Amino acid sequence: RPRFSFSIAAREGKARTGTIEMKRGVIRTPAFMPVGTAATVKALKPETVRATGADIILGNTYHLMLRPGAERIAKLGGLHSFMGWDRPILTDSGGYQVMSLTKQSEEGVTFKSRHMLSPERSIEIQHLLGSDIVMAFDECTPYPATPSRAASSMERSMRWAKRSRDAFDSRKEQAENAALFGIQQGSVFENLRQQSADALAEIGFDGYAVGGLAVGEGQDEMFRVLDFSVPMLPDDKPHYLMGVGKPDDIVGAVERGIDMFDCVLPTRSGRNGQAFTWDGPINIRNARFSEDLKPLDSECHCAVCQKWSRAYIHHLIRAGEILGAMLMTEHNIAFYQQLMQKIRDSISEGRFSQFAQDFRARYF
Amino acid sequence: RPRFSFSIAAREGKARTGTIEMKRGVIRTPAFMPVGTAATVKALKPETVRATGADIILGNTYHLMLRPGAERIAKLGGLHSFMGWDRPILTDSGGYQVMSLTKQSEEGVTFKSRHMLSPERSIEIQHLLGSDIVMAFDECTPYPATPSRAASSMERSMRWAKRSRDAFDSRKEQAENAALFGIQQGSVFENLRQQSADALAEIGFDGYAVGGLAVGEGQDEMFRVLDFSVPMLPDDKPHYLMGVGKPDDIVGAVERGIDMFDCVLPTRSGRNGQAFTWDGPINIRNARFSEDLKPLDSECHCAVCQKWSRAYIHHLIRAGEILGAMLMTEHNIAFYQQLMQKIRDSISEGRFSQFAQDFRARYF
Ligand SMILES: Cc1cccc2c(=O)nc(N)[nH]c12
Ligand SMILES: Cc1cccc2c(=O)nc(N)[nH]c12
Ligand SMILES: [Zn+2]
Ligand SMILES: [Zn+2]
Give the per-residue SS3 of chain A: CCCCEEEEEEEECCEEEEEEEECCEEEEECEEECECCCCCCCCCCHHHHHHCCCCCEEEEHHHHHHCCCHHHHHHCCCHHHHHCCCCCEEEECCHHHHCCCCEEECCEEEECCCEEECHHHHHHHHHHHCCCEEECCCCCCCCCCCHHHHHHHHHHHHHHHHHHHHHHHCCHHHHHHCEEEEEECCCCCHHHHHHHHHHHHHHCCCEEEECCCCCCCCHHHHHHHHHHHHHHCCCCCCEEECCCCCHHHHHHHHCCCCCEEECCHHHHHHHHCEECCCCCCEECCCHHHCCCCCCCCCCCCCHHHHHCCHHHHHHHHHCCCHHHHHHHHHHHHHHHHHHHHHHHHHHHCCCHHHHHHHHHHHHC
b (16+ CB within 10 A) / e for A283-294: ebeeeebbebee
Instruction: Tell me: cis bond preceding A30? Omega within 30 of 0 counts.
Output: yes
| β-strands B274-275, B282-283 pairing | antiparallel
Q: How many domains in chain A?
A: 1
CA–CA distance, B26 with A76 (Å, rounded to integer): 43
Q: Which of A55, A92, A132, A206 is catalytic?
A: A92
Our CA dihedral for B294, B297, B303, B308, rounded to 10 degrees, sits at: -20
B325/A contact by beta carbon, under 8 A:
yes
A71/B contact by beta carbon, under 8 A:
no
CB A208 within 8 A of CB A240: yes
SS3 B33: strand
Cβ within 8 Å of residue A362, ≥6 positions away: A278, A279
> Count of residues for chain B?
364
Q: Which amino acid is at B65?
A: M
Instruction: Tell me: cis bond preceding A144? Omega within 30 of 0 counts.
Output: yes
SS3 B7: strand
| Disruptive mutation site among A40, A79, A271 for chain B (greatest number of B CBs within 10 Å) | A40
CA–CA distance, A40 with A46 (Å, rounded to integer): 8
On the 0-12 / 13-18 / 19+ scale of CB atoms within 10 A, B340 is buried
Which of B180, B235, B208, B203 has the alpha carbon at shortest distance from B7? B235
Which of B83, B91, B88 has the alpha carbon at shortest distance from B128? B91
E strand or H helix that includes residue B208: strand B207-210
B290/A contact by beta carbon, under 8 A:
yes
Which of B175, B154, B176 has the alpha carbon at shortest distance from B166? B175
Which of B172, B244, B162, B170 has the alpha carbon at shortest distance from B205? B162
CA–CA distance, A273 with A287 (Å, rounded to integer): 12
What are residue A99's phi and psi, to 5 degrees?
-85, 45
CA–CA distance, A175 with A165 (Å, rounded to integer): 10
Range of the domain at A323: 1-364
| Disruptive mutation site among B35, B40, B308 for chain A (greatest number of A CBs within 10 Å) | B40
HEC secondary structure over B304-315: HHHHCCHHHHHH
SS3 B91: strand
* CA nearest to B45 within chain A: A323
On the 0-12 / 13-18 / 19+ scale of CB atoms within 10 A, B109 is buried
Cβ within 8 Å of residue A157, ≥6 positions away: A138, A139, A183, A185, A196, A211
CA–CA distance, A283 with A279 (Å, rounded to integer): 13
CA–CA distance, B8 with B27 (Å, rounded to integer): 12
C-alpha R_g of chain B: 20
Which of B40, B251, B122, B155 has the alpha carbon at shortest distance from A327? B40
CA distance A135 to chain B (A): 25
Helix then strand count (H, E) for chain B reads 16, 16
CB A290 within 8 A of CB B76: no
- Partnered with residue A181 across adjacent β-strands are A135, A207
CB A152 within 8 A of CB A111: no
Cβ–Cβ gap B326/A76 under 8 Å: no
CB B339 within 8 A of CB B270: no
SS3 B247: helix
Q: Is the CB of A183 under 6 A from ligand 1?
A: yes
CB B12 within 8 A of CB B343: no
C-alpha R_g of chain A: 20
User: Residues of B annotated as binding site?
Assistant: 92-96, 138, 185, 212, 300, 302, 305, 331
CA–CA distance, A301 with B170 (Å, rounded to integer): 43
What are residue B54's phi and psi, to 5 degrees?
-60, 135
Which strands form A239-241's sheet, in the order they lie side by side? A31-33, A260-262, A239-241, A207-210, A179-184, A133-135, A89-92, A57-60
CA B361 to chain centre: 26
| β-strands B5-12, A282-283 pairing | unpaired
Which chain B residues touch A76 with a CB distance below 8 Å? Answer: 291, 293, 309, 311-312
* CA nearest to B64 within chain A: A315
On the 0-12 / 13-18 / 19+ scale of CB atoms within 10 A, A175 is middle
CA–CA distance, A28 with A339 (Å, rounded to integer): 13
A65/B contact by beta carbon, under 8 A:
no
CA–CA distance, B221 with B216 (Å, rounded to integer): 10
Cβ–Cβ gap A40/B321 under 8 Å: yes
Resolution in Å equals 1.8
Q: Which amino acid is at B293?
A: L
CATH number of the domain at A166, please: 3.20.20.105
For this PDB entry, the determination method is: X-ray
